[PDB]
Structure formats: C-alpha cells, structure tokens
Design an enzyme around this catalytic site. Structure first.
Site, mmCIF file in Angstrom:
data_model
loop_
_atom_site.group_PDB
_atom_site.id
_atom_site.type_symbol
_atom_site.label_atom_id
_atom_site.label_comp_id
_atom_site.label_asym_id
_atom_site.label_seq_id
_atom_site.Cartn_x
_atom_site.Cartn_y
_atom_site.Cartn_z
ATOM 1 N N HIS A 139 -9.323 9.846 0.727
ATOM 2 C CA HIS A 139 -8.611 8.725 0.514
ATOM 3 C C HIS A 139 -7.283 8.704 1.284
ATOM 4 O O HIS A 139 -6.408 7.816 1.469
ATOM 5 C CB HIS A 139 -8.205 8.377 -0.765
ATOM 6 C CG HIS A 139 -7.393 7.180 -1.310
ATOM 7 N ND1 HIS A 139 -6.237 7.153 -1.208
ATOM 8 C CD2 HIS A 139 -8.035 5.864 -1.629
ATOM 9 C CE1 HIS A 139 -5.756 5.870 -1.396
ATOM 10 N NE2 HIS A 139 -6.895 5.169 -1.620
ATOM 11 N N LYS A 186 2.783 4.572 -0.458
ATOM 12 C CA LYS A 186 2.776 5.468 -1.506
ATOM 13 C C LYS A 186 3.996 6.706 -1.228
ATOM 14 O O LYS A 186 3.767 7.396 -0.209
ATOM 15 C CB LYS A 186 1.415 6.274 -1.612
ATOM 16 C CG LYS A 186 0.307 5.060 -2.083
ATOM 17 C CD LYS A 186 -1.152 5.600 -1.361
ATOM 18 C CE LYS A 186 -2.111 4.774 -2.202
ATOM 19 N NZ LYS A 186 -2.116 3.118 -1.328
ATOM 20 N N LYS A 194 -5.395 9.030 5.013
ATOM 21 C CA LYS A 194 -5.527 8.218 6.262
ATOM 22 C C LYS A 194 -4.719 9.226 7.535
ATOM 23 O O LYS A 194 -3.700 9.577 7.130
ATOM 24 C CB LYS A 194 -5.123 6.845 6.521
ATOM 25 C CG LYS A 194 -5.948 5.919 5.609
ATOM 26 C CD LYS A 194 -5.145 5.853 4.027
ATOM 27 C CE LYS A 194 -5.422 4.906 3.205
ATOM 28 N NZ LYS A 194 -5.834 5.318 1.876
ATOM 29 N N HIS A 238 0.899 -1.236 -0.079
ATOM 30 C CA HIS A 238 -0.097 -0.029 -0.059
ATOM 31 C C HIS A 238 0.982 1.396 0.080
ATOM 32 O O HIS A 238 0.376 2.226 -0.330
ATOM 33 C CB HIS A 238 -1.085 -0.054 1.279
ATOM 34 C CG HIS A 238 -2.057 -0.662 1.108
ATOM 35 N ND1 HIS A 238 -3.084 -0.483 0.112
ATOM 36 C CD2 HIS A 238 -2.644 -1.740 1.917
ATOM 37 C CE1 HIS A 238 -4.105 -1.533 0.738
ATOM 38 N NE2 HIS A 238 -3.864 -2.257 1.821
HETATM 39 O O1 LIG Z 1 -9.148 -2.698 1.389
HETATM 40 C C1 LIG Z 1 -8.537 -2.667 0.213
HETATM 41 O O2 LIG Z 1 -8.789 -3.728 -0.753
HETATM 42 C C2 LIG Z 1 -7.606 -1.591 -0.192
HETATM 43 C C3 LIG Z 1 -6.792 -1.752 -1.448
HETATM 44 C C4 LIG Z 1 -5.990 -0.753 -1.987
HETATM 45 C C5 LIG Z 1 -5.934 0.772 -1.433
HETATM 46 C C6 LIG Z 1 -5.253 1.740 -1.836
HETATM 47 O O3 LIG Z 1 -5.721 2.688 -2.164
HETATM 48 O O4 LIG Z 1 -3.826 1.456 -1.747
HETATM 49 C C7 LIG Z 1 -7.183 0.811 -0.275
HETATM 50 C C8 LIG Z 1 -7.061 2.154 0.532
HETATM 51 O O5 LIG Z 1 -6.018 2.831 0.668
HETATM 52 O O6 LIG Z 1 -8.164 2.402 0.819
HETATM 53 C C9 LIG Z 1 -8.002 -0.186 0.000
#
Ligand SMILES: O=C(O)c1ccc(C(=O)O)c(C(=O)O)c1
Length: 437
Positions: free
Chosen positions: A327, A104, A329, A102
């Site tokens: 988006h 970034k 957190k 995840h």
């Molecule tokens: O719960 C998941 O399947 C999920 C997958 C990818 C991401 C992302 O954006 O990298 C997110 C998020 O950050 O909300 C959630």
C-alpha cells in the site's frame, strides 16, 4: 537509517525483517516525545482503534482528524469521534469532482519540540497488519525561543513548503498548526516536500504541486548524466486511474516527461510500473482480502489494456515482504543496471491524473482533484551525486533502502493485474477462500 525511511511492521515475517520497522504504537510512544497535541491527516479512520494506539497517558490530549468525507460518510466519522471529547475534525474542501483527501501525515507537538510524519497507511488495523507501507520520520524540531528571530528554514525549503501545503486548506484548525510550525526550527530537514492540492494552477503556481512540482525540483536540484536516456523510471502503486485510450494521452506525454527530468538543459527511457498480479494477491499473507486495498476497477481497466504491458510483479525479498501486499507508493530513477538511483520519492499518490495533475487549457493550466503528500530524497541534499541501492533492506550507510527487488520482473503471459471487483474462483488463497465481490 540516516534517511529516516521506515517500513511498517508485518505480522508473520521473521524478526530480522521487523527489527528496523515501526508500528504506529512505536511512533506514538513516549520515547519519541512527550505528546501535547496531534493532527492526523488521512483518508480512512477507525477512531476507537486509533485512540488505543496512543499511550494511555496521552489518550486525552487533543487530536485533530483531517479528512475529506462528505454527506453520510462525514456523519459516520463524526459519530465515531463523538465519544472522545478531545477529538476535533477538519473537513478538507474538495470542490473539484471525484477528488479525495489521500494525504497521510501526523503532526506531533511535544513538550520537547515538534515532529512531522509523512506515511502511506490509513488509520485502521488492517493497514498496519500485513501490508508493505512506508514512513518518513522528521527529526525532532526544537522550538525557536520567544523573542528570537530566525527563519528555522532548511536548504530544501521544507518549512515554507509545508506551511504552503497547509495554507491551501483555508482551515482555522490548520492555521493553528501553521502557527505551531512557524515557532519551530525545521532547518535540519533534508527532504523536499511534494504535495498535491485540488485546483487549477497557471503561471508561477503551476510548479507548486503534482508532477510539475516534481519536474521543477528535478530541474533545479538534480544533474543530468551521460546516457541519461538509459536510466529507467520506476513507479510503484496500489491503484490506477483512467489514463486515456493510449500511452500518449497522459502517461508517456506529461507524466513520464516530468519523471525523466534531470537538470536545466533540454523518449526511449524505459518505464517500469510495479502493481500486484492476481497471483501476488492470492498467495499473499492476507490472501484475496488484500485486494480490497488494491482498488483497480474492471470499468477502468477494460478501457486501457495497453497499460498492462508496462506491469511488473510485486517482489520484495530484500525486505522479506514479497507476501505483504504494497500500500506504499514509490517512484524512483535507477541506473541502467539498477545499482544506483538518481532520486527516490515515497508518497500517497497513486498512478492517476487526480493525484498528479493533468494539463488543461492548451497546456497552460494544471488541474489536480485530490490532496496528496510525499517526500523526495535527492542526492544533492546529502552532498552526493547518486545513491547506492541497499542490497538487503535491513542489513556504508549513504546507501538508500529501496524496499522491493530490482530489476522489476515483468508479468508472465498468464499473469493479470489485480482487479478488485471481478471474481476469482479458479484457485484458493492462503486462507482457503475464493474471491466473490
Ligand atoms: O482508488 C481509490 O478508490 C482509493 C481510495 C483510497 C486510498 C487510500 O488508501 O487512501 C487508495 C489507495 O491509496 O490505494 C485508493
């Protein structure tokens, strides 16, 4: 903006709400540095779109894409990148089931130095269009002169900690970037790195990652205050994992316990969780499609209805972004009247054991499934005891720019958490449509 914390630009809000915001084209602009090479750590990529965000004169410089895709997903990404001879890929190992990459982050190597960008957006058009996303921009780090021996380290240990995060990939393309970082002076960095990497950590290594890393930093570099039990914890996220049958299984027993740490010595602390309601999503700029990026599934939610009594609506009048679904957190520790905060964290980590870690083997081992990365703002790192909360996000300057409204507002009795894979056909969204997954 002495904290160098930014929001992404949102299409459709008034200019006053984008004046201090950054689009990806701004970050990659020649004004930020003369690009030589870059690494893009992320989850989802649109490679054609991504290359168009670089300035034309920089579009053939080497790019490394760091991802976690396997099998056909990996094949699809390779096919996306194949037309661009300057693009290399690094597949992050995910040896524990149900883990994700995840993180970034951009590593930007310039003729003039090095920059690190830790942020929350996927490299696709929709994540930078009408969402609330967060960015931390490092200073321009100068190169250390060949033959000079200095650490280049900051009081927050950011240089060693970033190298440690990269070493956990065990990847040759990232050893190249570790050698780049070694050659630069990162001493001006005033944030702490909080990362997650997959594994099972015991002993000393337990404090390296996830919520134990946060706990250790708060123990070592924050102070407890009188009536600390009255300072709430706030968490704010775009997805939720399976947390267990009740709050004592993980949320309030180890997660909240780490988040409420302050100082070295030794719970009724309130916990506010901010997550969009169905109504938040329906009336958003994107409408129901914003819920495609809030992937809370009905299968998960129906096992933990106890959780939703913790949920508060998304509201962001302070930054004009009440209708730009989050988006980003964030996690933070405000005072009982929400006028100050003891610390602030922006991160990729959602509210899940996969991201933050869960204790195993009789509390001796911390197991993490995923890669995550964020930065922690601590008052001590700025010579302060607490941060004052900024009243208007874009309006002293030792005041921290919290991007959403305080106090958080509890869901109403008719509100429900956004759950992405059930239909909503009672009332149409801002584009005239229903939601039928
Ligand atoms: O719960 C998941 O399947 C999920 C997958 C990818 C991401 C992302 O954006 O990298 C997110 C998020 O950050 O909300 C959630």
């Amino acid at each position: 903006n002495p904290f160098q914390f930014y929001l992404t630009r949102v299409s459709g809000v008034k200019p006053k709400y984008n004046s201090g915001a950054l689009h990806i084209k701004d970050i990659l602009s020649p004004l930020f540095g003369t690009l030589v090479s870059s690494a893009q750590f992320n989850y989802c990529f649109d490679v054609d779109w991504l290359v168009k965000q670089y300035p034309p004169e920089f579009r053939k410089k080497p790019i490394l894409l760091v991802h976690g895709d396997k099998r056909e997903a990996k094949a699809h990404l390779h096919a996306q990148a194949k037309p661009y001879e300057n693009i290399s890929l690094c597949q992050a190992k995910l040896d524990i089931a149900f883990g994700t990459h995840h993180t970034k982050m951009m590593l930007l190597l310039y003729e003039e130095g090095l920059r690190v960008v830790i942020h929350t957006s996927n490299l696709i058009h929709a994540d930078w269009h009408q969402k609330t996303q967060g960015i931390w921009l490092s200073p321009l780090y100068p190169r250390i002169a060949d033959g000079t021996h200095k650490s280049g380290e900051s009081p927050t240990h950011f240089k060693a900690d970033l190298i440690s995060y990269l070493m956990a990939y065990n990847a040759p393309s990232l050893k190249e970037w570790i050698d780049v970082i070694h050659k630069h002076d990162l001493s001006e960095t005033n944030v702490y790195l909080i990362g997650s990497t997959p594994g099972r950590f015991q002993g000393s290594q337990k404090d390296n990652w996830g919520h134990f890393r946060l706990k250790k930093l708060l123990k070592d570099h924050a102070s407890s205050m009188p009536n600390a039990e009255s300072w709430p914890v706030v968490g704010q996220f775009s997805s939720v994992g399976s947390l267990g049958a009740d709050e004592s299984k993980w949320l309030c027993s180890e997660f909240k316990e780490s988040m409420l740490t302050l100082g070295k010595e030794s719970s009724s602390v309130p916990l506010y969780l901010i997550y969009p309601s169905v109504e938040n999503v329906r009336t958003s700029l994107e409408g129901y499609p914003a819920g495609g990026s809030l992937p809370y599934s009905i299968q998960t939610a129906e096992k933990q209805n106890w959780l939703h009594s913790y949920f508060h609506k998304w509201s962001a009048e302070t930054s004009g972004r009440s209708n730009a679904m989050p988006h980003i957190k964030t996690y933070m520790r405000p005072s009982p009247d929400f006028s100050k905060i003891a610390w602030f964290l922006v991160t990729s980590a959602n509210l899940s054991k996969a991201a933050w870690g869960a204790l195993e083997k009789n509390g001796t081992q911390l197991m993490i499934r995923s890669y995550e990365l964020g930065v922690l703002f601590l008052p001590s790192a700025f010579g302060l005891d607490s941060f004052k909360v900024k009243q208007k996000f874009f309006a002293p300057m030792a005041t921290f720019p919290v991007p959403y409204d305080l106090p958080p507002e509890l869901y109403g009795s008719k509100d429900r958490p956004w759950i992405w894979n059930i239909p909503y056909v009672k009332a149409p969204d801002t584009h005239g449509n229903m939601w039928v997954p």
